[PDB]
Symmetry: C2
Subunit: 70 residues, 2 copies
């Protein structure tokens, strides 16, 4: 109810962060194609880990919302 | 009958797909760190473009859910 709204806004903020992060990753991959250094690849690995966390967070929020709806 | 349920189920399968792709990207990055070849980096760039599209696919539904719930 008020929870469904809270969860929806939580998901929207996560989606915003995810979209932004995926765009960042795309640009970094282009840089790495120019210079595949260890440091840039370490950074990319870190961004992908962060991305997985955000996706997990959004999935958990959506599942909780599903539970409440059901 | 329940549109909030329909959409929530229609965001859950997208994220499940996104989660899979993200985990694939993570493993690929690890391989690129071992062999940063042009071919593997071209593949990574393709996977990230596909990821962008899936994230965008979540946008309309997210906005609908928000509109419906508010």
């Amino acid at each position: 109810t008020d929870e469904l709204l809270r969860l929806a806004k939580e998901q929207a903020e996560l989606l915003k962060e995810i979209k932004k992060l995926v765009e960042e990753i795309a640009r970094l991959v282009k840089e790495i194609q120019e210079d595949p250094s260890d440091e840039l690849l370490k950074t990319l690995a870190e961004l992908v880990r962060k991305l997985k966390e955000l996706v997990e967070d959004m999935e958990r929020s959506m599942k909780e919302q599903l539970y409440i709806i059901k």
